[PDB]
Design an enzyme around this catalytic site. Structure first.
Site, short mmCIF file in Angstrom:
data_model
loop_
_atom_site.label_atom_id
_atom_site.label_comp_id
_atom_site.label_asym_id
_atom_site.label_seq_id
_atom_site.Cartn_x
_atom_site.Cartn_y
_atom_site.Cartn_z
N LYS A 19 0.86 -1.19 0.00
CA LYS A 19 0.00 0.00 0.00
C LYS A 19 0.89 1.23 0.00
O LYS A 19 1.98 1.22 0.57
CB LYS A 19 -0.87 0.13 1.23
CG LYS A 19 -2.12 1.01 1.03
CD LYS A 19 -3.26 0.15 0.50
CE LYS A 19 -4.53 0.94 0.30
NZ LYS A 19 -5.70 0.01 0.08
N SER A 45 -12.92 -0.09 -10.38
CA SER A 45 -13.16 -1.35 -9.75
C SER A 45 -14.24 -1.22 -8.68
O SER A 45 -14.58 -2.21 -8.03
CB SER A 45 -11.83 -1.80 -9.13
OG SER A 45 -11.42 -0.95 -8.07
N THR A 96 -16.35 -4.09 -6.33
CA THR A 96 -16.22 -4.14 -4.87
C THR A 96 -17.63 -4.13 -4.28
O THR A 96 -17.95 -4.93 -3.38
CB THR A 96 -15.45 -2.90 -4.38
OG1 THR A 96 -14.16 -2.97 -4.97
CG2 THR A 96 -15.42 -2.92 -2.85
N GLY A 146 -22.78 4.00 -2.44
CA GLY A 146 -23.95 4.35 -3.21
C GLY A 146 -24.39 3.08 -3.99
O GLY A 146 -25.59 2.77 -4.01
N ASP A 190 -23.67 10.26 5.50
CA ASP A 190 -22.53 10.76 4.79
C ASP A 190 -22.25 12.21 5.26
O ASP A 190 -23.15 12.93 5.68
CB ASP A 190 -22.76 10.76 3.27
CG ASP A 190 -21.48 10.61 2.51
OD1 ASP A 190 -21.09 9.63 1.91
OD2 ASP A 190 -20.76 11.69 2.57
N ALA A 192 -15.39 -0.79 3.95
CA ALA A 192 -14.17 -0.20 4.53
C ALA A 192 -13.06 -1.14 4.85
O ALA A 192 -13.28 -2.27 5.24
CB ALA A 192 -14.59 0.57 5.77
N1 NAI Z 1 -13.40 1.49 -4.24
C1 NAI Z 1 -12.95 0.23 -4.08
O1 NAI Z 1 -12.81 -0.57 -5.03
C2 NAI Z 1 -12.58 -0.33 -2.79
C3 NAI Z 1 -12.73 0.53 -1.58
N2 NAI Z 1 -12.49 0.04 -0.30
C4 NAI Z 1 -12.80 0.78 0.89
O2 NAI Z 1 -14.10 1.16 0.92
C5 NAI Z 1 -14.26 2.43 1.62
C6 NAI Z 1 -15.05 3.34 0.69
O3 NAI Z 1 -14.39 3.38 -0.62
P1 NAI Z 1 -14.92 4.34 -1.80
O4 NAI Z 1 -16.40 4.31 -1.97
O5 NAI Z 1 -14.11 4.04 -2.99
O6 NAI Z 1 -14.55 5.84 -1.32
P2 NAI Z 1 -15.32 7.17 -1.54
O7 NAI Z 1 -14.36 8.29 -1.30
O8 NAI Z 1 -15.85 7.21 -2.93
O9 NAI Z 1 -16.60 7.40 -0.64
C7 NAI Z 1 -16.49 7.47 0.79
C8 NAI Z 1 -17.77 8.15 1.18
O10 NAI Z 1 -17.70 8.24 2.64
C9 NAI Z 1 -18.29 9.43 3.02
N3 NAI Z 1 -17.76 9.69 4.35
C10 NAI Z 1 -16.48 9.99 4.71
N4 NAI Z 1 -16.31 10.01 6.04
C11 NAI Z 1 -17.57 9.79 6.54
C12 NAI Z 1 -18.04 9.66 7.86
N5 NAI Z 1 -17.26 9.83 8.93
N6 NAI Z 1 -19.37 9.36 8.01
C13 NAI Z 1 -20.14 9.15 6.90
N7 NAI Z 1 -19.78 9.25 5.66
C14 NAI Z 1 -18.48 9.58 5.53
C15 NAI Z 1 -17.78 10.37 1.94
O11 NAI Z 1 -18.54 11.57 1.99
C16 NAI Z 1 -18.01 9.59 0.64
O12 NAI Z 1 -19.34 9.82 0.16
C17 NAI Z 1 -12.82 2.85 1.95
O13 NAI Z 1 -12.29 2.39 3.23
C18 NAI Z 1 -12.10 2.13 0.83
O14 NAI Z 1 -10.70 1.94 1.08
C19 NAI Z 1 -11.94 -1.24 -0.19
C20 NAI Z 1 -11.89 -2.11 -1.20
C21 NAI Z 1 -12.02 -1.70 -2.65
N1 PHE Z 2 -7.58 -0.04 -3.23
C1 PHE Z 2 -8.40 -1.23 -3.22
C2 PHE Z 2 -8.24 -2.07 -4.49
C3 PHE Z 2 -6.86 -2.35 -5.09
C4 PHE Z 2 -6.54 -3.69 -5.25
C5 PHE Z 2 -5.33 -4.12 -5.79
C6 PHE Z 2 -4.40 -3.16 -6.21
C7 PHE Z 2 -4.67 -1.80 -6.07
C8 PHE Z 2 -5.91 -1.43 -5.54
C9 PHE Z 2 -8.48 -2.07 -1.95
O1 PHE Z 2 -8.53 -1.60 -0.75
O2 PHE Z 2 -8.49 -3.31 -2.11
#
Ligand code: NAI
Ligand code: PHE
Ligand code: NAI
Ligand code: PHE
Ligand code: K
Ligand code: K
Ligand code: K
Ligand code: K
Ligand code: NA
Ligand code: NA
Lengths: 349, 348
Positions: free
Chosen positions: B78, B149, B153, B188, B205, B261
């Site tokens: 990471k 991706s 997820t 979402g 959010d 998360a």
């Molecule tokens: N996008 C992906 O493919 C993957 C994401 N994750 C994990 O999933 C989680 C969400 O990822 P994403 O949707 O991509 O990020 P994102 O940035 O698109 O969305 C996060 C959302 O959380 C809201 N938020 C932030 N802090 C908050 C709080 N304290 N209370 C309520 N809402 C709050 C934000 O306003 C935003 O709408 C993160 O921990 C990320 O690392 C893990 C695996 C893969």
């Molecule tokens: N950032 C994402 C997905 C990711 C996978 C593999 C390589 C890079 C990014 C996670 O928490 O899993």
């Protein structure tokens, strides 16, 4: 603190902690501008991890300048292994594990960093690293490397010393008093070279046997407590760095400083103080470059033993250029050597 | 903590400081046992450098476990870029420089580390990194990558939630109340899938507009201060990590925890508390693996989008295996998932 140590301007810092042995590992790459970073591996005990990071950083910066000023096509880096106990007490199993781990770290850098020996590491250790990674200088002759660089380093420091004493107006070394702090691989050789040229040697070492040997050879021992208070013509630091602090620079009683140690000057004010007092210092990174010339020359550039010897002697000429710059521009020898290093690097590009 | 920042047991930590932008860079390679380390780039502001180092190590370790448990041939790593100010406040030129430096850092690792997007980084950012280094997943489709991706997820999390609700004895999502914390790219989508399955959604959010929209889509908003004590059948953390501390574990009013998360459980102790209180937790590193499946599957194994979707759906089966070990061995779901990961990796 860790935070301050992490506020460093070099290209990259690699760290690792091995819970099983309790050792910490640091590899600092100051620059890769002239070529892959190169520098040895020092293994020692540090009070805090931050100290190992800071030492690695200063050592790596010195390697960058040493390579540049010596017209060697390599960047500068350094490895520091922060030991969980005194080297003495480290069992063979633990040392072998530490080396394997260090080799894995070097390996991931895939040629962007080449290691070599330093304090507490030797050619046998380089052969061990080489069992796991290709990027190692200093292997034993039998393993394909150039072996010990100590002698060449001594030759270079001795030539640095002669050029320095001459520029300072003291004439030749015959008859001059030279204080060698550190009778190690480099120091012991330097003491013998200086002696053959007629110098009167004053020596010091924490290792009493080494001192006894020097005394058997006619040299005069100096107590550790009096090293920095002993009058001499030349002070030759050949142990650890950081010896010349601002305080020591104000009272050092000598006319020239020329030794093998890396990072001799502890602080910038110390450099300004020696210059102002008329004590001519041959910059560490220029003076002690014979080790790098031997490893890089032999292992990378394909030079003969004869040519390495010649390039090491040429350290005297490089210093004459540095002094020239210092006198004409009104700057310290360290600043003038940095200027020269910059000119050479540019030329080399 | 100092121990997680400095006495971390992973394979390698890479750090760099760029005075000009004020940014600190951290790359942690937890393991390269199964292949090169891979993991995204998270860019955020941290109170102290120790917090950035701590998070990089925890996120990297989660990546190793995700790859191991998901049968993907990669190690875990990471990157964390500790920003000198809020992401939204960094100027374009500063951001551009930060990315170029980060790519030079990845490049020196020469293939031992493969990056991708994470919090605050996107496909366009991956394309920029790729202008300087080859070791980047998640480039846009136009540049040769697999693109986003997030949807994958979401699908994996949704299937994880379905498997968990069933194992917990609740039957299906139909008629359950699901509280989604974080209406982002993953959240979402998850909410839309859960609603379609018949669940009633509670949403939260910090972004006022996101909430109003969900509200428009028929959902119910929860104020931030009420999130952690709001009754629900399933709590789906899809915002930041570290949500479930010991105290939170003691007071959550739900029966299942399944979200996107990373590093949801703040302390080992919290895991035991959830277990003792009858709250069934779907381990984050198994649940949220769909993004890894998508990027590694597409980019390294040549899988199509349909195969990746199927593999993400299979995260439900992986969790059924985790629950079986949990029930049979009398250990928490996290311990069980660690055991399954080591078994699948043919020894830890
Ligand atoms: N996008 C992906 O493919 C993957 C994401 N994750 C994990 O999933 C989680 C969400 O990822 P994403 O949707 O991509 O990020 P994102 O940035 O698109 O969305 C996060 C959302 O959380 C809201 N938020 C932030 N802090 C908050 C709080 N304290 N209370 C309520 N809402 C709050 C934000 O306003 C935003 O709408 C993160 O921990 C990320 O690392 C893990 C695996 C893969
Ligand atoms: N950032 C994402 C997905 C990711 C996978 C593999 C390589 C890079 C990014 C996670 O928490 O899993
Ligand atoms: N060996 C080489 O090719 C090169 C070495 N250097 C530097 O020169 C210095 C000496 O290196 P080596 O001779 O190879 O190391 P070494 O390990 O062989 O010897 C160091 C010597 O200093 C003695 N010593 C240690 N602390 C002392 C103290 N406080 N007072 C007096 N003596 C003390 C040690 O006992 C030992 O005899 C180090 O700074 C090294 O980095 C620089 C360039 C090249
Ligand atoms: N360690 C020695 C020699 C060395 C040079 C180049 C590479 C590795 C080791 C020095 O400080 O110069
Ligand atoms: K040595
Ligand atoms: K060698
Ligand atoms: K993102
Ligand atoms: K139901
Ligand atoms: Na590891
Ligand atoms: Na709803």
């Amino acid at each position: 603190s860790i935070d301050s140590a992490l506020n460093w301007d070099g290209e990259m810092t690699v760290t690792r902690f091995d819970a099983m042995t309790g050792a910490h590992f640091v590899i600092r790459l100051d620059s890769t501008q002239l070529g892959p970073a190169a520098g040895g591996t020092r293994a020692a005990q540090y009070s805090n991890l931050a100290d190992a990071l800071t030492d690695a950083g200063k050592l790596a910066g010195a390697m960058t300048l040493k390579m540049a000023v010596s017209n060697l096509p390599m960047g500068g880096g350094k490895s520091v292994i922060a030991l969980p106990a005194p080297r003495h007490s480290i069992d063979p199993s633990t040392w072998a594990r530490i080396l394997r781990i260090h080799a894995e770290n070097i390996d991931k850098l895939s040629g962007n960093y080449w290691t070599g020996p330093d304090v507490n590491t030797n050619s046998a250790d380089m052969d061990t690293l080489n069992d796991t990674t290709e990027f190692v200088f200093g292997r034993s002759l039998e393993r394909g490397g150039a072996g010990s660089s100590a002698f060449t380093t001594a030759v270079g420091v001795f030539e640095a010393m002669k050029a320095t004493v001459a520029h300072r107006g003291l004439g030749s070394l015959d008859g001059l008093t030279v204080l060698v702090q550190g009778l190690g691989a480099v120091g012991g050789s330097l003491a013998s070279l200086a002696a053959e040229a007629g110098a009167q040697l004053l020596v010091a070492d924490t290792d009493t046997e080494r001192v006894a040997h020097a005394v058997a050879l006619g040299h005069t021992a100096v107590a550790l407590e009096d090293v920095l208070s002993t009058p001499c013509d030349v002070f030759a630091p050949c142990a650890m760095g950081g010896v010349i602090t601002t305080e020591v620079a104000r009272t050092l009683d000598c006319s020239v400083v020329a030794g093998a140690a890396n990072n001799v000057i502890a602080d910038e004010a110390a450099s300004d103080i020696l210059h102002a007092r008329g004590i001519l210092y041959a910059p560490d990174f220029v003076a002690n470059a014979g080790g790098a010339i031997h490893l890089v020359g032999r292992e990378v550039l394909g030079w003969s033993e004869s040519v390495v010897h010649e390039r090491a002697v040429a350290i005297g000429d490089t210093l004459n250029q540095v002094f020239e710059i210092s006198d004409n521009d009104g700057v310290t020898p360290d600043e003038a050597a940095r200027t020269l290093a910059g000119r050479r690097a540019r030329e080399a590009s």
